[PDB]
Amino acid sequence: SREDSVYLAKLAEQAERYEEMVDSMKAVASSGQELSVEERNLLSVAYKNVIGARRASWRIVSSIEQKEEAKDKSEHQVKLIRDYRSKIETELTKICDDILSVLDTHLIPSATTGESKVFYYKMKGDYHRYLAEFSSGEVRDKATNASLEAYKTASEIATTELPPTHPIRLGLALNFSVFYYEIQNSPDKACHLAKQAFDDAIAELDTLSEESYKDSTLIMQLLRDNLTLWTSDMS
C-alpha cells in the first residue's frame, strides 16, 4: 500500500532512522504516480538527512587529513585517513547517484505541476552540487555543469510558474546562490541572486496566509543570513 509506505516514512523520521525513511519514500517515488506535497517533502527530508551525516563525516575526516598531513604523521597513517575518506566519498557518490537516478527516471518525467517540476530540478541541482563538493579534476566540472543547468532549468520554471514568495522558489534561490558562492566561487552571482529573491518576496509577503508566511519567511531569513556572512567574508 502507498499510504503504508508513507506512514512508515513518518515513523522512520520520528525514530530518526533515515535509511529506512529513504527506502520507504524511494518505493513511493518509484511508482508512476506524482508525489503529493507531503510525500515530496518526506522524500527530500529522507535523502538530506542521509546525505547530511556523510557530508558531516567527510568534513571531519578531511580536517583530520589536512591537520595530520602537516608533519604530524607520514605516509601510511595519512594513507589510512585517505582510504577512509575515499570510502566515505564512495558512499556519498552512490547516495547521490541513487536519488538522481530516481529523479531522472521517475520524478521529473511524471511531474504535472510546475511546482513539482521546480522542486525536482532543484533536488537535481542539490545532489550534483554535493557531488561537486568532494570531487576533483574533470569529474568535478561535470558535476558543476550538471548542477548549474539543473538549477537554471528550475529557475526558468519558478520565475514563470511561481510567485516570488513561494517556498520552493525561495528555497531554489537559496541553494543556487549557495552553489555560486561555495562551488563556482562567484560572489557577484551569489549576492545578486539572494538579494533579488529576497526583494521580490518582501513586497508580496503581506499577501500570504499564515502557513505560507511561516514557510516563506523562514527561507528569507536564511537568504539574509547568507548575505550577511558573505558580506563579512568579503571584508
Binding site: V45, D126, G171, L222, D225, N226
Partner: peptide
C-alpha cells in the same frame, strides 16, 4: 553558509 533545510 546555509542551504534549504527541507
Amino acid at each position: 553558509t546555509a542551504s534549504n533545510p527541507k
